[PDB]
């Protein structure tokens, strides 16, 4: 994997109308993957995890990793992560969650659910003042229901 | 003085739509992460994050399941993103050099 750098000219012509994003590191990133459960084994989840860790590193993030956590461990550790002092001096934040899920929630390795509303709240303007006015990216690799999409014919 | 809503300046990319399943391959991993890494690595230099997530949506819309003899053969997935962003989000990778 390689990330093409932006040009000095691109930066000069775009930085005034974008979020400030020049800190080094650009932000902290968390990649939390649950692969072993009770909820079948998530074959290929190891490839996903490795890919994101590599990507976020190449995008200039300091990457934190967690694997196979219970719902309670996820909540506690996401909160620890949101409360880290580094957020005051970085310009953005990334959180990637990869597991089984249902609409609005994701599973811990114990088959218990963590609500995504609870996750986002940890990073909000009230609970995470260090990230106020800074862009916060979330990527959620999880099912949101058990309905398989059969697809439809194009008319 | 200017105050803030309780929640703002977030973007959330989801692998699938409400009510549905996201797809994953044993060898290549999840369709959505595979696409996300391909687009972000190629386009972070000149495209903002919401616009890259649109390119991801294009890739996912086009893919189909390969699983002969099960309910997943030729199945589909659609990704989405939700945004309370208030500006363009450029990652400006590798600047300054």
């Amino acid at each position: 994997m390689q990330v093409k750098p932006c040009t000095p000219e691109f930066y000069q012509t775009h930085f005034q109308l974008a979020y400030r994003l020049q800190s080094r590191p650009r932000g902290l990133a968390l990649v939390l993957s649950n692969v072993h459960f009770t909820l079948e084994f998530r074959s290929g989840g190891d490839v996903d995890h490795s890919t994101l860790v590599t990507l976020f590193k190449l995008l200039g993030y300091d990457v934190h990793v967690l694997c196979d956590q219970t719902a309670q461990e996820m909540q506690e550790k996401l909160q620890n992560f949101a409360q880290l002092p580094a957020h005051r001096v970085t310009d953005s934040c990334i959180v990637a969650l990869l597991s089984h899920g249902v609409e609005g929630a994701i599973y811990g390795v114990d088959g218990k659910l963590l609500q995504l509303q609870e996750v986002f709240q940890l990073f909000d303007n009230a609970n995470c003042p260090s990230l106020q006015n800074k862009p916060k990216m979330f990527f959620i690799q999880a099912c949101r229901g058990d309905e398989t999409d059969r697809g439809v014919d194009q008319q | 003085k200017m105050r803030l809503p309780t929640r703002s300046d977030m973007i959330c990319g989801y692998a699938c739509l409400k009510g549905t399943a996201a797809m994953r391959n044993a060898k290549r991993g999840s369709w959505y992460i595979e696409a996300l890494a391909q687009v972000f690595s190629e386009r972070a230099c000149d495209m903002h994050v919401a616009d890259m997530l649109v390119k991801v949506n294009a890739l996912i819309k086009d893919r189909e399941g390969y699983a002969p003899g099960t309910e997943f053969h030729r199945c589909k997935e659609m990704s989405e993103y939700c945004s309370t962003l208030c500006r363009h989000l450029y990652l400006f990778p590798g600047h300054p050099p």
Binding site: - | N25, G65, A67
Partner: peptide
């Protein structure tokens, strides 16, 4: 083969 997350 492709499977459900």
């Amino acid at each position: 083969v492709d499977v459900a997350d």
